[PDB]
Amino acid sequence: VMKLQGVIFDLDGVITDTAHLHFQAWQQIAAEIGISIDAQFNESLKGISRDESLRRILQHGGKEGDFNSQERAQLAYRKNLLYVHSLRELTVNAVLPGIRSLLADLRAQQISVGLASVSLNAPTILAALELREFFTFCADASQLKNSKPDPEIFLAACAGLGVPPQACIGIEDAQAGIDAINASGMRSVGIGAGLTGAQLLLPSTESLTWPRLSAFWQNVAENLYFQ
Amino acid sequence: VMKLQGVIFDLDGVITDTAHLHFQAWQQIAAEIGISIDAQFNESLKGISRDESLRRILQHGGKEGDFNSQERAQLAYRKNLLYVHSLRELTVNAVLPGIRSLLADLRAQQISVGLASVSLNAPTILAALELREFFTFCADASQLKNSKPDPEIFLAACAGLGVPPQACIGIEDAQAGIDAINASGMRSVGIGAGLTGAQLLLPSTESLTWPRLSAFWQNVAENLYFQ
Numbered sequence: 001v002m003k004l005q006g007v008i009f010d011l012d013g014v015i016t017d018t019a020h021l022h023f024q025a026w027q028q029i030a031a032e033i034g035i036s037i038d039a040q041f042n043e044s045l046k047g048i049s050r051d052e053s054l055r056r057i058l059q060h061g062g063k064e065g066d067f068n069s070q071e072r073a074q075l076a077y078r079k080n081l082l083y084v085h086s087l088r089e090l091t092v093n094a095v096l097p098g099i100r101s102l103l104a105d106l107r108a109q110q111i112s113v114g115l116a117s118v119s120l121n122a123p124t125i126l127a128a129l130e131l132r133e134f135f136t137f138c139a140d141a142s143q144l145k146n147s148k149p150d151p152e153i154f155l156a157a158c159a160g161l162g163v164p165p166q167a168c169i170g171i172e173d174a175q176a177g178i179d180a181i182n183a184s185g186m187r188s189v190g191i192g193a194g195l196t197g198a199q200l201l202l203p204s205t206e207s208l209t210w211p212r213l214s215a216f217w218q219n220v221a222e223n224l225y226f227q
Numbered sequence: 228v229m230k231l232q233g234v235i236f237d238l239d240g241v242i243t244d245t246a247h248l249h250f251q252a253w254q255q256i257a258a259e260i261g262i263s264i265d266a267q268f269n270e271s272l273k274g275i276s277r278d279e280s281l282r283r284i285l286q287h288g289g290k291e292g293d294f295n296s297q298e299r300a301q302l303a304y305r306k307n308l309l310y311v312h313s314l315r316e317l318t319v320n321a322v323l324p325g326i327r328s329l330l331a332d333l334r335a336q337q338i339s340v341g342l343a344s345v346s347l348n349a350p351t352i353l354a355a356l357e358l359r360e361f362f363t364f365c366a367d368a369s370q371l372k373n374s375k376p377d378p379e380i381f382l383a384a385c386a387g388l389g390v391p392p393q394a395c396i397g398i399e400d401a402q403a404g405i406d407a408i409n410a411s412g413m414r415s416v417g418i419g420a421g422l423t424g425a426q427l428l429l430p431s432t433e434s435l436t437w438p439r440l441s442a443f444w445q446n447v448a449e450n451l452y453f454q
């Protein structure tokens with residue numbers, strides 16, 4: 001059996017959820033220019049670029065004509081600033097169920113732990129969650145050329161851990177993330193119903209335990225022709 | 228470097244294209260009940276169940292009321308019969324470019340070749356294309372419980388070849404197929420722009436050569452920690 005050398009984690013939707021904080025920042029910037037948006041409006045911002053998100057908010061309040069590209073840039077700066085402050089305010093209680101105990105178990109088993117997050121705010125987030133001590137290496141999102149589903153960020157995490165991708169498990173909650181893990185050569189674990197292409201599919205982070213990951217590893221890593 | 232033990236092929240969209248033949252069979256059965264459909268109508272049959280495909284044809288001609296479920300079953304039987312006859316009429320020229328030369332090369336290299344097709348007509352098809360002699364094992368689609376993206380059909384092909392999935396390359400043209408290959412533990416090769424999650428993505432079957440597959444294998448199978 002090939003030895004498991006690393007377990008590499010996506011951040012959003014696996015370690016913690018940042019979606020509500022993104023919306024709350026947009027809602028605050030909107031309110032500061034006299035526009036009311038709600039969680040129902042936030043569906044219109046789901047999977048949308050930063051510039052188009054702001055434009056949709058402006059359209060919603062009939063205010064596209066009141067801001068040029070430079071002034072919109074200033075609104076976007078403030079929105080991001082408020083968002084990052086909210087990340088620094090996260091507590092240990094924002095970690096998803098099962099995650100802290102799994103990280104503790106991996107470290108007790110001397111398994112190296114990687115982070116493959118595309119967020120430039122990842123270190124700020126892990127610090128707030130009080131989880132930095134569990135990670136061996138975190139990929140640098142500021143150096144990323146292609147986001148998921150390109151395997152780059154996962155390949156970067158593996159290289160940082162100093163091991164080949166096939167000696168690692170990757171954990172994701174999104175299809176583009178599963179696709180990126182698969183394309184990199186890593187063994188894929190998905191969190192959430194509906195994901196396809198995962199070698200191990202779990203319904204939530206609570207199902208994510210060391211004994212389960214270890215059993216999964218022993219199953220997929222075995223090769224009669226290496227006995 | 229782990230030894231490459233098998234290359235496993237999807238049938239439709241990789242070895243040959245059956246889409247036009249499916250449409251031509253539907254068009255003939257439609258004509259036999261006085262209904263004219265064209266290739267433009269065939270978009271409405273794309274990714275549709277057999278029963279709903281027939282119902283849409285009947286609706287198109289205003290004839291839903293003229294056939295009960297048993298009579299529709301008789302129309303479906305004839306459509307399938309015409310379709311299967313057309314498969315038996317396929318010639319060597321229906322094989323996609325690059326495929327026959329690749330199969331010849333794999334066999335010269337003593338690499339076992341598998342088929343992972345969900346079609347019950349696969350053996351009829353390979354016989355017509357004069358390709359049976361290149362295949363070591365073909366998975367039995369009549370025993371299949373879950374179709375792609377479930378990895379079952381690829382796992383069945385690997386088991387039939389007597390080797391673990393990770394010692395095999397799988398080749399697919401569809402996203403559900405790539406997902407199935409990935410979930411099985413096999414190394415994935417995709418044919419067609421737009422596919423995600425493939426370890427090697429090629430634009431067409433013409434790009435699919437032994438030297439390329441071999442270079443791909445040597446790259447992904449290497450592990451410093453096995454030297």
Ligand SMILES: [Cl-]
Pocket residue numbers: 010011012116117118119
């Ligand atoms: Cl992330």
Ligand SMILES: [Cl-]
Pocket residue numbers: 173174175176
């Ligand atoms: Cl998703």
Ligand SMILES: [Cl-]
Pocket residue numbers: 237238239343344345346
């Ligand atoms: Cl097929």
Ligand SMILES: [Cl-]
Pocket residue numbers: 400401402403
């Ligand atoms: Cl597809």
Ligand SMILES: [Mg+2]
Pocket residue numbers: 010011012013014172173174177
């Ligand atoms: Mg995520």
Ligand SMILES: [Mg+2]
Pocket residue numbers: 088089090091128
């Ligand atoms: Mg704090």
Ligand SMILES: [Mg+2]
Pocket residue numbers: 237238239240241399400401404
């Ligand atoms: Mg296909």
Ligand SMILES: [Mg+2]
Pocket residue numbers: 315316317318355
């Ligand atoms: Mg013939």
Ligand SMILES: [Mg+2]
Pocket residue numbers: 182185186187409412413414
């Ligand atoms: Mg894989």
